[PDB]
Design a protein around this nucleic acid. Structure first.
Length: 206
RNA sequence: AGACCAAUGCCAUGUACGUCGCACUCAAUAGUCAGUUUUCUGCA
């Protein structure tokens, strides 16, 4: 087990943080756990909506949750009853007056959360993994994407030993720190157990 | 160059490699008949 998380080593360099509140030591743990609850809830209740990121920020006793998603229409719905329902329950969880926004992730096959969730969904619909991976690399390289690597792992095809079998195309410069590597990871709970899907997407060199 | 260095339970090893798709709507040509009599009308 030996590679650094390629989001974490780029946190001040190119990648931003998904939480951008300041807090002293008295409320740092409380704000942090409140963020675990709103991302847990808001991740479970938008499983069909293809959600990429949820960014929390707290401007002066009020949360401001931004849902980067690929299907904004299914998040908002017929006149946005679903949004006001979500800020009602996020205001229930965080205990502050909640705002909520939706940022449309166009080009959803270049986002690693959406790619890993895609391949994970296909693996738990019992399709063969080489199609899922290989289709994901092809259609991601089709639109921009100066590199992509996907990597499934663990008891693939229902075996009794676990393999990995990664694929990559293009250039994925993972030790370069100015590389805009969009990396994310999902787990596929199949009837044989968990299958881990990692995906790195190299977008640009700065 | 050219001292000395002995041995290393029992098994089965594997899953596993067989491939795809697209579409679409605009125009001619119902019905309308007739219209007193003439005439100067700048000039070189």
């Amino acid at each position: 087990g030996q590679k650094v998380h390629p989001n974490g080593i780029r946190l001040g360099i190119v990648k931003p943080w998904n939480s951008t509140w300041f807090a002293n030591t008295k409320e740092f743990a409380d704000n942090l756990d409140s963020d675990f609850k709103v991302r847990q809830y808001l991740t479970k209740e938008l499983a069909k909506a293809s959600v990429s990121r949820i960014v929390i920020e707290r401007p002066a006793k009020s949360i401001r949750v931004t849902i980067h998603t690929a299907r904004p229409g299914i998040v908002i719905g017929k006149k946005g009853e679903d949004v006001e329902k979500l800020r009602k329950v996020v205001a229930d969880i965080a205990g502050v007056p909640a705002q909520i926004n939706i940022a449309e992730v166009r080009k959803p096959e270049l986002d690693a959360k959406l790619v890993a969730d895609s391949i994970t969904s296909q693996l738990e619909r019992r399709v063969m993994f080489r199609r899922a991976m290989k289709r994901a690399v092809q259609n991601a390289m089709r639109l921009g994407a100066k590199g992509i690597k996907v990597e499934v792992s663990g008891r693939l095809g229902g075996a009794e030993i676990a393999r990995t079998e990664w694929y990559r195309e293009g250039r994925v410069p993972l030790h370069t720190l100015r590389a805009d590597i969009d990396y994310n990871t999902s787990e596929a709970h199949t009837t044989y157990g968990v299958i881990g899907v990692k995906v790195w997407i190299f977008k640009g060199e700065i």
